[PDB]
């Protein structure tokens, strides 16, 4: 299976073997510990692969649900009184981290129900204190647009993953405004990374918008391939006209960009286009299931899991 590494690693109660250093006691480290447990539960439940266990299906499902629930309680330790989240307990709030927590909790809600009011509070904190008038998001106190495009896309991903839990008009409006910022400022692109994160974020909303389809086509025109017809397909983080070389080895930003390209394409149901992409991702995966860093790892695992549910 494509999801074999994380499945084996989660069932063994071991780490997924991400290469990068995650500082002890950081919110990101705790969020990344629950990440692989969710995608496993999500694969087994949605794909109906409790058959895998020949012992007791109901007992094993409960055992994973407990681990999932223990991860939730740990994440809550980083929550502030205003329902924002901090990277370190007692440190200042981060819009980025709050958006990352909403993505994880929004996804986990599917199988372990979150406190609806708590999620609402976090979403409203995010939208009312850190969205600018132009619809972009800012963090707590050419290069500016790139930073704004990144954080907005990243924040939109978090909001979209938690939206159905708290579909308030203030939040709906914030998404409309944030999506419009991305639609208006993504092309002409400055990097494939920023283009890819914008594309994936927009793919979680209105997939019929004409400028979303131009953004996606611009991303597809940055594709690197091996073979004729392509056996592998992937993306690097810099645009061809800025750096026209071909890469010799993998990087974190390469896997992350590729992952966002994959997730965008799966949301458009483009199953023919994706097979060479998963092939490449499958070979970049390490023993354990992790990749280079946290964000390339989360999105790559999501891509592999959603592909496996769509195809098998």
């Amino acid at each position: 299976l494509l999801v074999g590494e994380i499945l084996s690693a989660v069932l063994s109660q071991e780490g997924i073997n991400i290469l990068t250093h995650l500082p002890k006691g950081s919110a990101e480290a705790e969020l990344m510990s629950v990440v692989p447990v969710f995608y496993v539960f999500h694969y087994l439940e949605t794909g109906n692969h409790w058959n895998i266990f020949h012992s007791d299906p109901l007992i094993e499902k409960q055992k994973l649900k407990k681990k999932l629930k223990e991860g939730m309680l740990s994440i809550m330790s980083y929550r502030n009184a205003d329902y924002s989240y901090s990277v370190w307990k007692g440190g200042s709030a981060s819009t980025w981290l709050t958006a990352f927590a909403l993505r994880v909790l929004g996804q986990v809600n599917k199988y372990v129900e979150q406190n609806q009011n708590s999620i609402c509070n976090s979403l409203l904190w995010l939208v009312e204190n850190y969205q600018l008038d132009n619809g972009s998001f800012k963090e707590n106190s050419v290069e500016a647009r790139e930073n704004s495009l990144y954080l907005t896309a990243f924040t939109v991903i978090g909001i979209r993953k938690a939206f159905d839990i708290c579909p308030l008009v203030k939040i709906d409006t914030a998404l409309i405004k944030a999506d419009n910022f991305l639609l208006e400022n993504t092309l002409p692109a400055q990097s494939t990374f920023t283009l890819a994160i914008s594309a994936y974020a927009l793919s979680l909303g209105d997939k019929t918008h004409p400028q979303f389809r131009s953004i996606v086509s611009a991303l597809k025109r940055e594709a690197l391939v091996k073979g004729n017809p392509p056996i592998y397909r992937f993306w690097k983080d810099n645009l061809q006209h800025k750096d026209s070389s071909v890469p010799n080895t993998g990087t974190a930003r390469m896997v992350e960009t590729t992952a966002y390209a994959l997730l965008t394409s799966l949301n458009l149901k483009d199953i023919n286009y994706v097979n060479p992409v998963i092939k490449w991702l499958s070979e970049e995966q390490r023993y354990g299931g992790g990749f280079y860093s946290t964000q390339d790892t989360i999105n790559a695992i999501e891509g592999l899991t959603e592909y496996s549910l769509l195809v098998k």
């Binding site: 597809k220 025109r221 940055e222 594709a223 690197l224 391939v225 091996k226 073979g227 392509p230 592998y232 397909r233 061809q240 006209h241 026209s244 071909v246 890469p247 010799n248 080895t249 490449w280 070979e283 970049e284």
Partner: peptide, 15 residues
């Protein structure tokens, strides 16, 4: 030999 980086090319070459 890491075959996935052997003979990689741009799918839509600029030139």
């Amino acid at each position: 030999c890491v075959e996935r980086f052997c003979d990689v090319y741009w799918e839509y070459p600029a030139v």
